[PDB]
Amino acid sequence: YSYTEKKRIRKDFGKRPQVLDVPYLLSIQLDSFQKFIEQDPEGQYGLEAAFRSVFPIQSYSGNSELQYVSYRLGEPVFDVQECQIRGVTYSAPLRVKLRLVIYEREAPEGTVKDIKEQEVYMGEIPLMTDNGTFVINGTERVIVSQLHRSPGVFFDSDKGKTHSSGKVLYNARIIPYRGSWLDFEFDPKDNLFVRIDRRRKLPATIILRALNYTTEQILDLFFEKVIFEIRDNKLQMELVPERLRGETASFDIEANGKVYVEKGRRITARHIRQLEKDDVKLIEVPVEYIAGKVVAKDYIDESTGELICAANMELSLDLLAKLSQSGHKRIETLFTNDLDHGPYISETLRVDPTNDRLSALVEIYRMMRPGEPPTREAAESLFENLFFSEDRYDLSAVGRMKFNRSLLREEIEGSGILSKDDIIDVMKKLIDIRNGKGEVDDIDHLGNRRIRSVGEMAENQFRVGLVRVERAVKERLSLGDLDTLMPQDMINAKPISAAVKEFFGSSQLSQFMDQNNPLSEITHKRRISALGPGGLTRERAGFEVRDVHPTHYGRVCPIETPEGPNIGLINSLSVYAQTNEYGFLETPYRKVTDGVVTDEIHYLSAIEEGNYVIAQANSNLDEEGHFVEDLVTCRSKGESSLFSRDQVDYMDVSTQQVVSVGASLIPFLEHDDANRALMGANMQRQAVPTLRADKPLVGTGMERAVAVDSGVTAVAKRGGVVQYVDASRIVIKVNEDEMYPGEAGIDIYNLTKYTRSNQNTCINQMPCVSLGEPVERGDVLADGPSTDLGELALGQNMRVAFMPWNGYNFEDSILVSERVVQEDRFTTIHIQELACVSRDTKLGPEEITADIPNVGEAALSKLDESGIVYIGAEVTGGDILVGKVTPKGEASDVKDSSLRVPNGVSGTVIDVQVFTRDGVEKDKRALEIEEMQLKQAKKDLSEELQILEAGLFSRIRAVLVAGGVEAEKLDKLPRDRWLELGLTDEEKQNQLEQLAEQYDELKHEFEKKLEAKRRKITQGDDLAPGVLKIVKVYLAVKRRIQPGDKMAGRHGNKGVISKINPIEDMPYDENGTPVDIVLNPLGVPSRMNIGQILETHLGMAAKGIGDKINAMLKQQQEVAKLREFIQRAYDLGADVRQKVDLSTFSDEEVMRLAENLRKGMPIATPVFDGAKEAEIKELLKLGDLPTSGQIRLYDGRTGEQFERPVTVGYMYMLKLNHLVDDKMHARSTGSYSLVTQQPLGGKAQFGGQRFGEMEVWALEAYGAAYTLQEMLTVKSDDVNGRTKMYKNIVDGNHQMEPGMPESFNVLLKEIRSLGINIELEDE
Amino acid sequence: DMIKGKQGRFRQNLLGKRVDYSGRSVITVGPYLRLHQCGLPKKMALELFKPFIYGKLELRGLATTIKAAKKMVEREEAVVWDILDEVIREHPVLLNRAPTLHRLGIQAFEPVLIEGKAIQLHPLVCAAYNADFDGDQMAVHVPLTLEAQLEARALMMSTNNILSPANGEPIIVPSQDVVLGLYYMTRDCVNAKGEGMVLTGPKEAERLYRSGLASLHARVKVRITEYEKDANGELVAKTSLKDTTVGRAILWMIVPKGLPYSIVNQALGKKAISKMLNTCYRILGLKPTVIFADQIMYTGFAYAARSGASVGIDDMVIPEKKHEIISEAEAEVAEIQEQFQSGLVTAGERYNKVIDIWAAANDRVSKAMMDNLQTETVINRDGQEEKQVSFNSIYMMADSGARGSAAQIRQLAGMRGLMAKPDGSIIETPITANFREGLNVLQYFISTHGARKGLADTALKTANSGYLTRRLVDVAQDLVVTEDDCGTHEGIMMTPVIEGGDVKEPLRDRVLGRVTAEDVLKPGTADILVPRNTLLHEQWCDLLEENSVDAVKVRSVVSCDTDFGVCAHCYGRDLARGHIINKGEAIGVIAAQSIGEPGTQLTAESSIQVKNKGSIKLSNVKSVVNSSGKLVITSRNTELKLIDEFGRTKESYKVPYGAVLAKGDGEQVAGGETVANWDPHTMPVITEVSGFVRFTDMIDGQTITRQTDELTGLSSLVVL
Ligand SMILES: [Mg+2]
Ligand SMILES: [Zn+2]
């Protein structure tokens, strides 16, 4: 086991052996941005791709080409921590190599001049932190992945609402990544219409006309021919028997001398077999049959030249006679089977008004730009650039792969531009499905829904910047002269960097980190949003989209989603899932070799999963990968059933892979209704870090993975031994094995103490380890917020009893004992930030001095001479945080603009920061802050130098001992007196000058490094135009739990703390221990969350064991007893994958482990492979507790016994962020709004309640006329009315003076101001 | 532009503003409160009533000027709290909860100063507010002028609004903890401590129970004096020995004078308590009902706490015969599937068979579990043994009506039935496991889908409701009761709607509180039962059930003659109060709210079979008896009603043209006897006379196609 694991082992239930370990949970973000930067030769995904896409930039036929070589990411100027402190964006400079080449002009082009630009600076790109986030202005932002429809072609149905007469009208949509959209739809009359991206629907054939296809060519390509030969007389037809499928006979079908099908009887299978075996090709047919068909080609009279029938014209006897007399032996008619093969392109051609290519292009042009006369070449160029221009129309590699796969073409790699064969095949498939030989696609299939992560969106935005700047360079290179200018006045970085920072900063998917819980961080980073750019808007989207598709299995969490209005549009990603090479979603599966379940894992996407039969994870395997049952339970096409042993292709990796991290943290998920599990997870992500987090008594084992993988813990990078421990830094001496040979030194981890998180919570790290303990690579040195010894401890575990106690827990409300507040276990620290900004006005700059007009010295007492509060001073609402004066001109004094503490907030000033970009004057506080940072830098550098210096001196002593041993005199004189000493002239003297010069070089490197650090510290941190300086002040406030606050469990049970009872009143067991929480039973039966009951039982068992060992340990019997007891406990049955034992060191580690477990041994029930009841019963028995898990309790107030014993035990509860002191609010009178004199809205400013129209109706239902009267005039809007009412109340009388509202009188004057006579009548 | 448009004026100006002297905070239980009061935090009360405080402080002379009043309030000295206490005595405040669906969403209470930052809300009214203690917050307004105060105390106070304006029933009925406690209190046990001793009254019953010399429920003979106001408002004591439990006597202590003892003698569940309150209100009046409800709450809470009811893992008993049922149903599904693979049954037929057999197995297991759990306490008396309604805590929570229904009990201990896939089709294999046991990935996943769909439905339903109710309240706002009586004779003849099998809804409730259009006569003329228009209160309604009035013409609002409004008489009485409507109340808005707010939880026939023994009567028919001896139905609008022994129409059916009949008129039909017959998917055309069929305008070929079979007389002549 690891060292932190050996510290406190967690008793793990769970039967199936974990084959795959949980991957790095933040893989998505880091891997995507790595792919984004990813210096690579062959243009694959990556910035490189964008450059090669946009370059080469050739002049407007000016023969001055621009070429791209390569780019380089500059080293960031600001590290992460200092960047947060100083309020700048953490970024790297981007530099690109270009060449300008000028060839022969008015001559065959030949390279005349080539100039190389000196590594042009092309702007700043923000870098991503180690944890996978972005610091954009000293605020931690996250870029959520976006789920959206993949490029390609989709055949939709859109039925039901089509004219309410059935008539299912199909449609094919071609969507590219970049370029216009193509749409083919039908009409009630089965005519197939095309609609350019989002316009009206035109007949499709016009586009076919634009592609240069003649009507006969089209009818050739689409319709099945029917041949009519005339041999010596009367119209004999060449017939393929198999064409007759499903056709009532219209004529008498005689053949070879024998009538086969009588005229009128539909051809039966008997006749079909007869005719087939007879081998009948041609049959003479009556002229009435042909008197109805349609002609395919445009048969002209070859002899004379006169046209007779046109392409797709109905046949009449006269036309048949003309054709027969003209001498046409071979006739090609159309096959119109009114059942299967319809005349769709024919009828579209009939409705199609355009005839020539030119008329089609004219109509097209008149569609895009209606009203301006279309010129031929304009239409030609438009159509060319529409779908076949490499630059404007590009689908993708992914778009093209999906496109070819949808139409069943073997070739995966295509051209970006839309080729003609693509469109023709698409139309063929559309008409095919229209006949019914095909299925429509379902949008909700994850095989049709692709995930765009950060790097892809950043790449797109950067490309946009590039296309802009390319146009710019193009024009400047065209107009301006060619050879005078060098390639840096010409290219401007400002708009590109502007676009990148707008995207990263001001975007829908780029949002503030939800930073109060480690779980909150980890779940926020692994999120998939369907909104944003190219994302569905919430209101129009249908219920069908927000349902859970069977494809989501093992890819997205079914249970974790906000329960607000956008439920189902968020869908947090599952544990084990990954992104494909093309941005699809894949999940791991174990291969199945016919009998044995092997150990190699393959990642499968949605489509591949669809085909196979996948076995469940909870299937019993004995020692060689064979299923115990003959018929096992699997799923094949999204539906589960029984399959045979020797049919399963794959098997689920583990039971946990269905659910997200949040859901995986809930114990006994298998016993909770899905609704309450959903709400439980959603709430559990809101828990606030307490003062000392401890641990869950009932966990799932995932706590350490979450804590480590989040960046809140401090984790060792190179293993070694802890040299120095302080409550600010941990300094570790590396082990010699891993110790780098040249210029290694030791490792130092600086910790972070109370700082403000996004949610105003405290972020503090505590050291775990002590002096002299050995640490290995990857152990947890320091605990972050709300984590203990590596484990996630969101809340705390307390002793609950399920009973109604005089209706104080009537509804879901909760009763709590005074011991919890006395022992201070639910008290949190919060942290507000306040900012005072001194800008430069045109009347004169404001000042920060402490000299503030007409303020009493009481207010100054807590201010220093510079005008900033002392660190540690206690302030209250309304106190002056800092002193500022606004200058007055045309005097500067007599008025104060000093910032004050907001009303009703009181805490201690823990920190102050000052930012003066100008650097004018500087200030006292800047000097103190600079010295605090500087002294630290000095200490660290001094420590490193002294270690390296001690080493150099040891080597100097080892050389000095050679060549004449001198050990008496040397060791007692100071060490600095060893360089001035001498030795016999030899190579040894050469070594002494060498070592002296290396000592000097270490000094000089030290001095320059120090100078550099001091230059970085001193420089002004670039502020916005007009602001001289800014001072930020952090207040910290300790909030204790009180009645009205909200508390919850992990299973969805909620409540408001209703009353704090004295300890004596609370129920107590015979032993005298009072319970902590009194929980309502009536929440169980209707809210079928049974997981809390099992959790309570198992928690009592675990705390019982912990109590027994604490009791046995306080008496300190002997090591032997402890080892025996702990072993018997840890074994507890069989089938467990634990395997612990006493192999660990014999005395120290056991004593430490007992000390840590004495507070209760932590259990680990996995989600679905959990602890069954019998095991809980056994564990309760081992502790000497009632097996039924309920005990008899005596009422602490009255003393009589309760009938029917009650369930008690320990449950892990959380205090949610809904804290009563923020919610409570009241106003009598206060500030009103400027334009409409209504009271301000909000809590910061006093603010009134919104008396809506529904409340008006409620009051109107009663006869409450006077209440409404005051509500409309006296309470809000009437100025004179409100002051008169105030004065009347002050006078001690409670009346009012009625009349017409003045606003109404204003109305009279405004309406009267028109030519309208409106009079106030009287009687 | 200033006048027209939203932003300009009217549409925004006088539509939805923020008011003063208002606050908002979280609500909390506070059981010790009286029904007409509410717990209010000190600090909020001070902030709200600030100007009152200043006025009273200046009146008492404690402060020379107003600024001194502010300084003394910001120090918060004892005098300030004394003045605040003095001003608060009778001043009422308005409580509102964000979605004010109906007029009971705003009510006035008297505040009691308490510590803390949470508002304390009386439990009984939560049902009216639809309030839940899971972080719901509430708003609190202060009426300023004197008329507003008077209006709040008279019209809007909680105790004045006990009946819902929608229907007449009480709103403040005990909800969950109270009913559980009372249920525990009244149930009896075969054998306990203090079996069969005779007590002189309830007071020594309490002596016995509280001293632990007798169990709270144990059968006993007690002497009790009930009072009855049988005379013209005088109470007569009747005193006798009844056989009851100690608990029922203890409960009897509270019960006001007028009520018969019988009321408490039963198991006393939710319904029983509700009807108890109903009778108490109808007989005694408002104030006794209020005090009785408060007493019920206190005793229920107390004895529920003394009961100590909890929920352990062993409390939900898995039925012993579940596994057999599951194995049998699996074997049956396997046999039907194999017999499908051979191809004697379509896929749809197999689907239907599997779904039906699984449903049957589910019902079997549910009934077996309910039998096992319900009456399993086989506890022993002195000698032989006996069995009784069990004391299983979960069973008491189910049966009392406090929480949960049979369905959830099933969902805990049985198989959780069949599920529906997205499109509504039902999965072939059900979820055999239950929450006491553990589900597996597939079954969980399925239930997740279910819950997601359910919640989304509820969301959209709420949006649609809001929209509908807004239109309703908008359209009907102006209607007001302006006149006392228009004096019309018109009215609607109201009958009890007897849809098919029986009387879904009786007359008495349908007519209660409506004035009659004209006097109705007994089944014998000149026997006037009700004078010209009288308000039909409970006594008249009871009078109508002993007699057999079937249909009553009552004045309706639609036929009212009054111009520009309605008259009191045409409307009737029904209100939160009991009496005839008062001139001036805006009934349009109350009606619109009452119809809108509840709208948020809304998502073969071959032979007739008489259910109860009665005479058959045919209405609106003209039959012609044929040779077979059948009463041939020749009318499409024929009805067959059922007169009972005492002249009342129990069952009513509609008999179509061409249905074979058996019994005519007068015949008494035995229970469940087939009186009629006809082809379900076939309406035959019946000839009245005999002879040869003659074809007229029946030409062959033009409009009909002769497709005729051989001698046996089959044909396909089709008159299209
Ligand atoms: Mg709530
Ligand atoms: Zn009327």
Residue numbers in the entry:
A (entry chain C): 3 to 892, 910 to 1342
B (entry chain D): 329 to 931, 946 to 1062
Question: What did the published study say regarding this structure?
Answer:
The structure of all cellular RNAPs resembles a crab claw, with the β and β′ subunits forming two “pincers” that surround the main channel of RNAP serving as the binding site for the DNA template. In proteobacteria including Escherichia coli, RNAP recycling is facilitated by RapA, a Swi/Snf2 protein superfamily ATPase. To understand the mechanism of RNAP recycling by RapA, we determined four sets of cryo-EM structures, including the RNAP EC, RNAP EC with RapA (EC–RapA), RNAP core enzyme (RNAP), and RNAP core enzyme with RapA (RNAP–RapA binary complex).
The clamp primarily remains in its “open” conformation in the RNAP core enzyme, but it closes upon formation of holoenzyme, open complex, and EC with DNA/RNA accommodated in the main channel of RNAP. To study how the RapA influences the RNAP clamp conformation, we determined the cryo-EM structures of the RNAP core enzyme and the RNAP–RapA complex at nominal resolutions of 3.41 and 4.8 Å, respectively. In the structure of RNAP core enzyme, the main channel widely opens for separating the β′ clamp and β lobe 39 Å apart.
